[PDB]
Design an enzyme around this catalytic site. Structure first.
Site, PDB file in Angstrom:
ATOM      1  N   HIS A  63       0.765  -1.256   0.000  1.00 29.28           N
ATOM      2  CA  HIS A  63       0.000   0.000   0.000  1.00 29.28           C
ATOM      3  C   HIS A  63       0.796   1.306   0.000  1.00 29.28           C
ATOM      4  O   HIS A  63       1.914   1.369   0.496  1.00 29.28           O
ATOM      5  CB  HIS A  63      -0.865   0.041   1.280  1.00 29.28           C
ATOM      6  CG  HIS A  63      -1.533   1.364   1.530  1.00 29.28           C
ATOM      7  ND1 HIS A  63      -0.859   2.453   2.043  1.00 29.28           N
ATOM      8  CD2 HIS A  63      -2.817   1.764   1.373  1.00 29.28           C
ATOM      9  CE1 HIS A  63      -1.689   3.473   2.161  1.00 29.28           C
ATOM     10  NE2 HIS A  63      -2.887   3.080   1.766  1.00 29.28           N
ATOM     11  N   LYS A  73       4.057   6.330   8.030  1.00 27.78           N
ATOM     12  CA  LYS A  73       3.501   5.268   8.867  1.00 27.78           C
ATOM     13  C   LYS A  73       4.532   4.843   9.902  1.00 27.78           C
ATOM     14  O   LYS A  73       5.717   5.058   9.692  1.00 27.78           O
ATOM     15  CB  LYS A  73       3.097   4.071   8.027  1.00 27.78           C
ATOM     16  CG  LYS A  73       2.061   4.385   6.966  1.00 27.78           C
ATOM     17  CD  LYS A  73       1.668   3.151   6.203  1.00 27.78           C
ATOM     18  CE  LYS A  73       0.663   3.473   5.117  1.00 27.78           C
ATOM     19  NZ  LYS A  73       0.277   2.235   4.393  1.00 27.78           N
ATOM     20  N   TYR A 133      -0.541   0.314  13.418  1.00 27.01           N
ATOM     21  CA  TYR A 133       0.289   1.327  12.796  1.00 27.01           C
ATOM     22  C   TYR A 133      -0.384   2.676  12.770  1.00 27.01           C
ATOM     23  O   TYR A 133      -1.587   2.770  12.547  1.00 27.01           O
ATOM     24  CB  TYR A 133       0.816   0.917  11.429  1.00 27.01           C
ATOM     25  CG  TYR A 133      -0.195   0.754  10.329  1.00 27.01           C
ATOM     26  CD1 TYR A 133      -0.393   1.769   9.396  1.00 27.01           C
ATOM     27  CD2 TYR A 133      -0.917  -0.423  10.200  1.00 27.01           C
ATOM     28  CE1 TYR A 133      -1.312   1.618   8.367  1.00 27.01           C
ATOM     29  CE2 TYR A 133      -1.822  -0.583   9.191  1.00 27.01           C
ATOM     30  CZ  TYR A 133      -2.009   0.440   8.276  1.00 27.01           C
ATOM     31  OH  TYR A 133      -2.924   0.268   7.272  1.00 27.01           O
ATOM     32  N   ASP A 169      -6.476  -6.704  -3.164  1.00 25.24           N
ATOM     33  CA  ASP A 169      -5.029  -6.788  -3.109  1.00 25.24           C
ATOM     34  C   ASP A 169      -4.420  -7.597  -4.272  1.00 25.24           C
ATOM     35  O   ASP A 169      -3.248  -7.413  -4.599  1.00 25.24           O
ATOM     36  CB  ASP A 169      -4.574  -7.280  -1.724  1.00 25.24           C
ATOM     37  CG  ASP A 169      -4.737  -6.203  -0.626  1.00 25.24           C
ATOM     38  OD1 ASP A 169      -4.296  -6.463   0.520  1.00 25.24           O
ATOM     39  OD2 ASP A 169      -5.281  -5.097  -0.906  1.00 25.24           O
TER      40      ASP A 169
END
Ligand SMILES: Cc1cn([C@H]2C[C@H](O)[C@@H](COP(=O)(O)OP(=O)(O)O)O2)c(=O)[nH]c1=O
Lengths: 175, 175
Positions: A63, A73, A133, A169
């Protein structure tokens, strides 16, 4: 306090929090804003995400949220373990297209600071893996994008042959 | 998005985030600064703490940091379950010395916003419980205080007769 294990691609940082144990268990400051700034990580995080994957070999990513909503992140594993990969997609960068695989687990308490301009994903190594995260920019389904896990240009050595992936995905574009 | 299950003592809130579950596990935004603001919760968290207790029946608390360095705490359980208790210690409150016990678990994903001016503690209910909490003021050793877990005035029906405590929690001062 929290310390830097290694720095790669100029800005990516593998970090380790100082743990304080007893026979009763342990305590740790898993995040300290002012401490991070000392380690050259200055970001104001606005959201915390928790990813639960029931089966080992589940792949989440790769991603990246396209600008103007790029996200920094900071990832850690609360339960289980994962093989986390980051790819430098900054075309200007000397380390452009390069990647690195890190093992983040509940036992090592390691964290990875993924800068803006990077693709990020992971493979769970055991059942019931929980990843947490933080992101410094809110989620935008509009700008949500990525890179197909098995892109042959990157040739990432995933520890699984037939990854558990969502349909979304399995249709991410190439590098 | 996030929903406030109940509100007590004017300011303490039991929260529950949105959970996106599918065939692979789930994803949830455990923290969202914008969302919390729309619910009336506004704070700048600067530190995330993690507490792991090996055995069930471990009590941590009751604890508060002295003013002017009082802390707002956002409690959550990542693994296991707890009986979490808060006590209103604001001398100028119509609920001063009242308390409420909440059950937070990795399976309910509920979170508790503990305002500044309250004592907070919890009893682990199963082995290997992991509790994560966010605070809006850093740890200040000189400002560390609390209430005795088994204080006589506080009714607190803990679900453990002989809990596991640190030496300092057994030493904590009575209300
Ligand atoms: C509450 C807190 C404690 N600590 C440290 C101080 C202590 O040496 C250690 C354990 O905290 P504490 O729970 O107070 O000790 P005990 O286990 O004896 O009750 O963690 C922090 O670094 N940051 C914090 O926000």
């Amino acid at each position: 306090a929290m310390k830097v294990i290694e720095t790669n691609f100029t800005d990516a940082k593998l970090l380790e929090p100082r743990l304080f144990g007893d026979d009763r268990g342990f305590f740790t400051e898993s995040y300290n804003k002012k401490v991070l700034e000392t380690l050259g990580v200055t970001h104001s995080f606005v959201q915390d995400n928790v990813s639960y994957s029931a089966e080992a070999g589940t792949i989440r990513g790769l991603h990246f949220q396209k600008n103007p909503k790029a996200q920094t992140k900071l990832i850690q594993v609360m339960q289980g373990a994962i093989y986390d990969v980051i790819v430098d997609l900054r075309k200007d960068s000397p380390t452009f297209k390069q990647w690195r695989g890190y093992i983040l687990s509940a036992d090592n308490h390691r964290q990875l600071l993924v800068p803006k301009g990077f693709a990020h994903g992971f493979c769970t190594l055991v059942p019931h893996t929980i990843v947490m995260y933080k992101v410094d920019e809110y989620y935008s389904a509009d700008h949500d994008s990525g890179v197909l896990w098995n892109d042959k240009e990157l040739a990432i050595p995933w520890p699984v042959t037939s990854p558990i992936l969502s349909d979304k995905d399995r249709i991410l574009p190439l590098l």
